[PDB]
Write a protein that holds these residues in place. Structure first.
Motif, PDB file in Angstrom:
ATOM      1  N   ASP A  28      43.687  32.593  39.381  1.00 35.81           N
ATOM      2  CA  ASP A  28      44.729  32.996  40.371  1.00 35.81           C
ATOM      3  C   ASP A  28      44.173  32.838  41.788  1.00 35.81           C
ATOM      4  N   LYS A  29      44.893  33.311  42.772  1.00 34.94           N
ATOM      5  CA  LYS A  29      44.417  33.193  44.182  1.00 34.94           C
ATOM      6  C   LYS A  29      43.735  34.499  44.601  1.00 34.94           C
ATOM      7  N   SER A  30      42.982  35.098  43.711  1.00 31.75           N
ATOM      8  CA  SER A  30      42.280  36.377  44.044  1.00 31.75           C
ATOM      9  C   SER A  30      43.309  37.446  44.424  1.00 31.75           C
ATOM     10  N   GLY A  31      44.486  37.375  43.855  1.00 29.45           N
ATOM     11  CA  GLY A  31      45.540  38.382  44.176  1.00 29.45           C
ATOM     12  C   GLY A  31      45.218  39.701  43.471  1.00 29.45           C
ATOM     13  N   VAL A  36      41.512  35.693  36.538  1.00 25.98           N
ATOM     14  CA  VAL A  36      41.191  34.638  35.525  1.00 25.98           C
ATOM     15  C   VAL A  36      41.728  35.031  34.146  1.00 25.98           C
ATOM     16  N   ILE A  37      42.705  34.317  33.645  1.00 27.27           N
ATOM     17  CA  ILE A  37      43.248  34.647  32.293  1.00 27.27           C
ATOM     18  C   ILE A  37      42.596  33.710  31.260  1.00 27.27           C
ATOM     19  N   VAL A  38      41.915  34.265  30.293  1.00 28.55           N
ATOM     20  CA  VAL A  38      41.242  33.421  29.263  1.00 28.55           C
ATOM     21  C   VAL A  38      42.122  33.337  28.014  1.00 28.55           C
ATOM     22  N   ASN A  58      43.823  37.419  28.176  1.00 24.59           N
ATOM     23  CA  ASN A  58      43.344  38.688  28.799  1.00 24.59           C
ATOM     24  C   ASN A  58      42.836  38.409  30.216  1.00 24.59           C
ATOM     25  N   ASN A  59      43.202  39.244  31.156  1.00 21.83           N
ATOM     26  CA  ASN A  59      42.749  39.046  32.563  1.00 21.83           C
ATOM     27  C   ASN A  59      41.259  39.380  32.666  1.00 21.83           C
ATOM     28  N   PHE A  60      40.553  38.712  33.542  1.00 23.94           N
ATOM     29  CA  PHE A  60      39.096  38.984  33.709  1.00 23.94           C
ATOM     30  C   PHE A  60      38.650  38.511  35.093  1.00 23.94           C
ATOM     31  N   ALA A  61      37.746  39.227  35.707  1.00 19.81           N
ATOM     32  CA  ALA A  61      37.255  38.826  37.058  1.00 19.81           C
ATOM     33  C   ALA A  61      36.234  37.698  36.899  1.00 19.81           C
ATOM     34  N   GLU A  62      35.924  37.008  37.967  1.00 19.27           N
ATOM     35  CA  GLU A  62      34.933  35.892  37.883  1.00 19.27           C
ATOM     36  C   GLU A  62      33.576  36.443  37.435  1.00 19.27           C
TER      37      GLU A  62
END
Length: 69
Positions: A28-31, A36-38, A58-62
């Protein structure tokens, strides 16, 4: 860096797929904190009715993902 379609080992403690790897689907744009969806090809039905919910992502940060490609 989390590339596209790269193998990333999820490192989220409280996660339905923690300890397993997933295929990066898109970023995503860091919103949000987890843009990051894996992909895991795994479903977690825990309350569905009418509209087919389903997750499979699942959503996940960098920093939460570990690119081991």
């Amino acid at each position: 860096a989390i590339e596209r379609g790269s193998k990333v080992k999820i490192l989220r403690k409280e996660s339905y797929w923690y300890g397993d790897v997933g295929t990066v689907a898109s970023i995503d744009k860091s919103g949000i904190i987890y843009p990051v969806i894996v992909r895991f090809n795994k479903v977690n039905y825990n309350g569905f009715s009418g509209s087919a919910g389903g997750l499979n992502t699942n959503n996940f940060a960098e920093h939460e993902l570990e690119v081991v490609g």
